[PDB]
Amino acid sequence: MLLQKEREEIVAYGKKMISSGLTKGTGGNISIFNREQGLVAISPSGLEYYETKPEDVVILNLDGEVIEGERKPSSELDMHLIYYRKREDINALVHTHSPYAKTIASLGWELPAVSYLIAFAGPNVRCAPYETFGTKQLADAAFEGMIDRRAVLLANHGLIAGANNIKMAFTVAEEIEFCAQIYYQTKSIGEPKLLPEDEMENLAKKF
Amino acid sequence: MLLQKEREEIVAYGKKMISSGLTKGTGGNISIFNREQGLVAISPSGLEYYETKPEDVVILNLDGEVIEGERKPSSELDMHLIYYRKREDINALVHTHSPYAKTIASLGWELPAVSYLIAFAGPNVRCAPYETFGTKQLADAAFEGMIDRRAVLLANHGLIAGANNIKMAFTVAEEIEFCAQIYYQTKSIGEPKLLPEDEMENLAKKF
Amino acid sequence: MLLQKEREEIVAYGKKMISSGLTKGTGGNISIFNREQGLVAISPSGLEYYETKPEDVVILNLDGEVIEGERKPSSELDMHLIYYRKREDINALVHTHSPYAKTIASLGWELPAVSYLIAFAGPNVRCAPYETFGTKQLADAAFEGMIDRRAVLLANHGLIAGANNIKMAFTVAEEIEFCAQIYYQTKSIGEPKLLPEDEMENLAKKF
Amino acid sequence: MLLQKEREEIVAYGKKMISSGLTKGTGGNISIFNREQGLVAISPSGLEYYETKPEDVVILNLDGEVIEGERKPSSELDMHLIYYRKREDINALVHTHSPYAKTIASLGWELPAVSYLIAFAGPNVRCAPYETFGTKQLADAAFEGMIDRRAVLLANHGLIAGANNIKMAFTVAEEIEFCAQIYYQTKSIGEPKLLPEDEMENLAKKF
Ligand SMILES: [Mn+2]
Ligand SMILES: [Mn+2]
Ligand SMILES: [Mn+2]
Ligand SMILES: [Mn+2]
C-alpha cells in the first residue's frame, strides 16, 4: 500500500488517543503528510480506533481527492488539509476531544502560560470561535487561530495540534491537554501565577 | 435460547458500562427490544456485570411477564418497558449511574447545548424530577422527560439513553456523560458559551 | 490455617481497594469477624495489597491478642475491634482512604441525602471529629459517629463502612465514596437537591 | 554494570511514575545515590519510561560528570545532585509532574496540614518560587524550599520528594500528590480544617 509507514503510525496513535483519555468513541482524528509525494494519510470516519487496521486509513492528495482506500475519510479532512497547503512546518496533526482542553474551549478562553509546558505550543494557545464540525469554515478558523503556534483550541469542540512529525504532534496534544487541566483546576480555586513573555521566549529556545 | 443475539449484546455492553466508568457495582441496567417478536431482553437485577452470562439475561413480553430466564429481571424494568410501548423509535436502552450526569441531575438542572455532541440526544437534555427507583412513577417521569429526545437525566439518580440499536444507545449514554463533564467543569470556573437553537437544528441533520 | 475463608477474602478485597481507587499505597485496612469462634481476621500493617498472601492476614481475639500470624496486625485494629464488641450487626469492616470521602471529611462535613444510594449507609453519614490514627480515641470516635449507621467519615482521614458480610461492607464503602463524589461536585457549582427524611426511610426498607 | 541494583530500581519506579499518574510523557525524573561509592544513578533525559532499560540509566559522580552510560542524563540532574551534596539524609529522589501538586504549585501556595499524611513530608510542604527548568537556579530554589522537609512544590512545574531509600521517596511523592488532591478539592467548595502544629509534631514521631 501507499504510505505504509504512515498508515501504521495512524493506527498506533489513534489507539493511543483512546488509551490516553484524549478522546471518546470515534471522535477526533489523525493525519500524517508525506511531503515527498504530496500525499496525506488520514484516519477513517466513524471507525473504532481499536478496530482500525492500516488498510482502513485513507490516502488523499492535497486537493482532497481519495487516492487509495475504500473507507470514507475523516469528516474533518478539510481542517487537516489546510495546514499541509498553507504552512510548510507541519507534517502531522492530532485532533482530540479531550476534556480539559474542551472545557477551556467551551468558555471561549485562551490558554495562557500557566506552565512551562505551554511552550510545546507557543507562548499561549488561542481559542478559535465556533464553526460547524466538518466544514471549510472550521478549517479556516482552526488554521487562523493556530498561526505561529503548534496547537489551537476549538470552541465547544476540542483541540488540534501539529508538529514536524507524529510523535511530536501527539506530545503537543497530550501536554497541552495537561496544561488545560492545570489551568482549569487553578481557576477553580484561585488565580494562577503565569510565566512572563520573555521566559516563554527563553523556553521556546530551550525546547 | 430466545433473543440470543440480544442476550450476548447485553452481556457485552454491560461490561462496557463498568469498564467505561458509566456505573458502579451492580447499578444501572440495559435492555434491547426485538420488535418482530415483541420481546425485551433485559439485564438481571443485582448481578455483577463481569459475572453475567447470556443465560442470566431475562426475556420479558411487553406486559412485563417473564418468558425465559430464571433470574429476577432488573428492578428498573418498568422504566424500560414504557419506551417500547409508548414510542416506536427506540429499540435499545442504556441506564447509567455515571458521575457527571448524576451531578447535573442532582442539582435538578437541564443539560444545555454546551457541545455539538449534545445533538446525540437532541437540542438539550431535560431533568426528570425525583421519583423512587424501581417504580412506575419513575418510569412515567423518565419517559415524559425524554419526549422528542434520546436521553434524559433522572434527578439524584443518573441518566437513561435510547436509540434505534444498542450501539447507538450506548454512544448516546457515553457522549452525554462527556457533555455533562464539560458542563460541570465549565460551570466550576465560569459561564460556558452555548450553541444557538438553529445550529442544534442543523447538527441534528448532520448527525 | 484458622479462618481460611476469611483470610482469602481479606486478600481479595484488599486488592479490590487498590484497584477501585479506594486507597493509596498501604493505607486503609480490612477485617472480617467469625462470630462462631469470636475471632477476627485483619489485614497486616504496612504491606502492599498485591503482595499480601492469606498467611499474612492476622487472626486476633476480641481482646486484641494475636492468635495466629507472625505479621504485625493493622495499626488501626482498635477501630475494628470496637464494632465486634459493642454492636452485633456488623461482621466485616472496610476502612478506606478514598479521595471524595476524605474531601468531605476534611471539611468536617456530614454527607447528606444527595443520592438514593446514601441509604446503603443510612439517612446520612456523620463525620467523626479528628483523633490520631491508630489510637483508642479514634476507635471511640469512629464507633460513636457510626451509631445506627453502616458508615462514618473520619475527619482529615477517610471512611469506614461495616455490614453483615464483606461483600456488603465493600459495597457500602464504594457506594458512599461515589455519593461523596456527587456531593463534592454538586457543591462545586451550586446547591444539590436533597432527598427528604421520609423517603430515606422508605429507601431503607426497599434496600 | 555499576550500580546495577539502583539501575533496575530506577527503571521499575519510572514505569510506576507513568502507571500511577504521577507524570505525563517523558516528564519527571528519578535518582538514587550510592553513598558508599559516591555515585548517583539517574534516569536518562527524554526517554519513554516503558522503553527504558537498566543500561539506559546514567551513572554520575557528585561533580556531575558521567562515569558510565552513553545516554544523556536527565536535564534536571543539578536539582538531584544538590541534595546528595548538601544534606546527608536523602539517598533517593522522585521528581514528578503530577496534576494536583502542580495545581497547588501553580498558585504559588504552600500545602498545609490538611491530612495526617502530610507528615510523610513534614508539618507542611513549601512552594519554591519559579526558576527555569534544568538550571542551577532551580536546583538551589528546590533545595532551599525543602530544608527540613522530604518534599517541596516547584512553582508552575511539579514536585520533588526525597527519602532514605527509593521505596520511601516514591511513597512521599505519591502521598503528597494525594494530599494536594484533597487540598485542591476542599478549597473548591469550602475551607478545610487543618491539623495543629503539635499534632504534626506527634505524627512525625508516630510515622
Ligand atoms: Mn472533532
Ligand atoms: Mn438506576
Ligand atoms: Mn486510615
Ligand atoms: Mn520537571
CATH number of A131's domain: 3.40.225.10
Distance C151 CA to ligand 1 centre (A): 44
Distance CA C105, CA B139 (A): 35
Q: Work out the number of other CB atoms within 10 angstroms of the CB of residue D190.
A: 15
3-state secondary structure B14-69: HHHHHHCCCCCCCCCEEEEEECCCCEEEECECCCCCCCCCHHHCEEEECCCCEEEC
Burial of D134 (0-12, 13-18, 19+ CB in 10 A): middle
Q: How many domains does chain A have?
A: 1
Residues of chain A positioned with their CB less than 8 A from the CB of D100: 185
Residue A6 in 3-state DSSP? helix
Residue of D nearest to C190 (CA): D189
Which distant-in-sequence residues (6+ apart) come within 8 Å of D63 by Cβ? none
Query: How far B109 CA lies from chain C's nearest CA (Å)?
Result: 10
A20 interfaces chain D, CB cutoff of 8 Å: no
For residue A7, the 8-state DSSP code is H
Q: Going along C23-143, which residue ranges are E strands? A: 29-34, 39-42, 58-61, 66-68, 92-96, 127-128
Chain Cα centroid distance, residue C88: 16
Nearest to B179 by CA among C107, D139, A25: A25
Single-letter residue type at C20 = S
Let me know how long chain C is: 207
Distance CA D12, CA D130 (A): 30
Single-letter residue type at A180 = A
C129 interfaces chain D, CB cutoff of 8 Å: no
The rounded radius of gyration (Å) of the Cα atoms in chain B is 16
Which distant-in-sequence residues (6+ apart) come within 8 Å of C18 by Cβ? C49, C50
Residue B93 in 3-state DSSP? strand
Query: Are D106 and A182 an interchain contact pair (Cβ–Cβ within 8 Å)?
Result: yes
Helix (H) or strand (E) holding D59: strand D58-61
Alpha carbon of B165 to those of B12, B31, B91, D75: distances in Å?
A: 14, 10, 6, 53
Chain Cα centroid distance, residue C113: 19
Number of helices (H), then strands (E), in chain D = 6, 8
User: Chains with ≥3 Cβ pairs under 8 A against C?
Assistant: B, D
* DSSP secondary structure, D145-178, as one string: HTTTSSEEEETTTEEEEEESSHHHHHHHHHHHHH
Query: Are C191 and B109 an interchain contact pair (Cβ–Cβ within 8 Å)?
Result: no
CA atoms within 13 A on the CB side of C4: 1
Distance CA D46, CA D133 (A): 14
Strand partners, D73: D44
Ligand nearest to the CA of B25: 2
The residue whose grid cell reads 443518573 is B158
Chain Cα centroid distance, residue A154: 10
Which distant-in-sequence residues (6+ apart) come within 8 Å of C78 by Cβ? C64, C134, C135, C136, C138, C139
Distance CA C75, CA B108 (A): 43
Structure-determination technique: X-ray
Distance CA A190, CA A49 (A): 38
Ligand nearest to the CA of C101: 3
Distance CA D105, CA D110 (A): 7
B173, B16 contact by CB (below 8 A)? no
Distance CA A97, CA A91 (A): 21
B152, B139 contact by CB (below 8 A)? no
Distance CA D140, CA D146 (A): 10
Query: Are C132 and D189 an interchain contact pair (Cβ–Cβ within 8 Å)?
Result: no
Query: Are B114 and A184 an interchain contact pair (Cβ–Cβ within 8 Å)?
Result: no
Helix (H) or strand (E) holding C75: none
Distance CA B152, CA B110 (A): 9
For residue A44, the 8-state DSSP code is B
Query: Are A130 and B191 an interchain contact pair (Cβ–Cβ within 8 Å)?
Result: no
Laid out side by side, the sheet with A158-163 consists of A66-68, A58-61, A39-42, A29-34, A92-96, A158-163, A151-154, A127-128
Q: Work out the number of other CB atoms within 10 angstroms of the CB of residue A167.
A: 11
Residue of D nearest to A189 (CA): D188
Extract long-range pairs of D6-11: CB within 8 Å, 24+ residues apart: D6/D32, D6/D34, D6/D41, D6/D57, D7/D41, D7/D54, D7/D55, D7/D57, D7/D59, D8/D54, D9/D41, D9/D166, D10/D41, D10/D42, D10/D43, D10/D54, D10/D57, D10/D166, D11/D49, D11/D52, D11/D53, D11/D54, D11/D56, D11/D57
- Phi-psi label, residue B134: left if phi above 0, alpha if psi -120 to 50, beta otherwise: left
Per-residue cell: D140: 538551589
For residue A154, the 8-state DSSP code is E
Distance CA B129, CA B117 (A): 24
Distance CA A34, CA A55 (A): 17
Give the resolution in Å: 1.7
Which distant-in-sequence residues (6+ apart) come within 8 Å of A205 by Cβ? none
Laid out side by side, the sheet with C58-61 consists of C66-68, C58-61, C39-42, C29-34, C92-96, C158-163, C151-154, C127-128
Distance CA C150, CA C164 (A): 10
Which distant-in-sequence residues (6+ apart) come within 8 Å of B55 by Cβ? B1, B7, B69
Pairs of CB atoms within 8 A across A/B = 60
B32, B92 contact by CB (below 8 A)? yes
Helix (H) or strand (E) holding C117: none
Distance B103 CA to ligand 1 centre (A): 25
Per-residue cell: B197: 437553537
Nearest to B123 by CA among B207, B65, B61: B207
Alpha carbon of A191 to those of D8, D104, D130: distances in Å?
A: 41, 11, 16
- Name the residue facing C103 among D117, D186, D202 (closest C-beta): D186
Chain Cα centroid distance, residue C191: 28
Question: For A167, phi and psi rounded to 5 degrees?
Answer: -60, -45
Burial of D49 (0-12, 13-18, 19+ CB in 10 A): buried
Angle at D146 between CA D141 and CA D151, to 5 degrees: 120
C27 interfaces chain D, CB cutoff of 8 Å: yes
Distance CA B89, CA B68 (A): 25
Per-residue cell: C129: 471529629
| A76 a catalytic residue | yes
Distance CA A18, CA A27 (A): 9
Distance CA D71, CA D66 (A): 10
Sign of CA dihedral D22, D24, D28, D33: positive
A22, A179 contact by CB (below 8 A)? no
Alpha carbon of D5 to those of A50, D19, D32: distances in Å?
A: 38, 21, 10
- Name the residue facing B182 among A25, A99, A108 (closest C-beta): A99
Question: For B139, phi and psi rounded to 5 degrees?
Answer: -60, -45
Distance B20 CA to ligand 1 centre (A): 20
Nearest to C173 by CA among C117, C116, C96, C115: C96
Distance CA C181, CA B102 (A): 10
Question: For A161, phi and psi rounded to 5 degrees?
Answer: -130, 145
Query: Are B182 and A108 an interchain contact pair (Cβ–Cβ within 8 Å)?
Result: no
B182 interfaces chain A, CB cutoff of 8 Å: yes
Strand partners, C160: C95, C152
Query: C171: domain range?
Result: 1-207
Find the catalytic residue in D76, D131, D174, D177: D76
Query: How far B89 CA lies from chain C's nearest CA (Å)?
Result: 30
Distance CA C103, CA C118 (A): 17
* DSSP secondary structure, C152-203, as one string: EEETTTEEEEEESSHHHHHHHHHHHHHHHHHHHHHHHHS------HHHHHHH
D35 interfaces chain C, CB cutoff of 8 Å: no
Question: For D120, phi and psi rounded to 5 degrees?
Answer: -60, -30
Residue of B nearest to A157 (CA): B115
Angle at B186 between CA B184 and CA B190, to 5 degrees: 125
Distance CA B84, CA B79 (A): 10
Kindly provide the b/e burial profile for residues B22-41, where b requires at least 16 CB atoms within 10 angstroms of the residue's own CB: bbbbbbbbbbbbbeeeebbb
Chain Cα centroid distance, residue D65: 22
State the greatest distance between any 2 C-alpha atoms of chain B, in Å, as a whole number: 53
Alpha carbon of D91 to those of A12, C72, D62: distances in Å?
A: 39, 27, 13
Ligand nearest to the CA of C133: 3
Let me know how long chain A is: 207
Which of D116, D177, D189 to substitute to test the interface with C, most C CBs within 10 Å? D189
Q: Work out the number of other CB atoms within 10 angstroms of the CB of residue C95.
A: 27
Ligand nearest to the CA of B101: 2
Alpha carbon of B4 to those of A5, A199, C162: distances in Å?
A: 42, 63, 40
Which distant-in-sequence residues (6+ apart) come within 8 Å of B132 by Cβ? B138, C116, C199, C202, C203, C206
Burial of A59 (0-12, 13-18, 19+ CB in 10 A): buried
Q: Work out the number of other CB atoms within 10 angstroms of the CB of residue C80.
A: 28
Per-residue cell: C135: 489510637
The residue whose grid cell reads 469550602 is D190
* DSSP secondary structure, A52-106, as one string: --GGGSEEEETTS-EEE-SSPB-TTHHHHHHHHHH-SS--EEEEE--HHHHHHHH
Distance CA A12, CA D44 (A): 25
* DSSP secondary structure, C5-20, as one string: HHHHHHHHHHHHHHHT
- Phi-psi label, residue B95: left if phi above 0, alpha if psi -120 to 50, beta otherwise: beta
Sign of CA dihedral B180, B181, B182, B183: positive
Let me know how long chain B is: 207
The residue whose grid cell reads 481559542 is A127
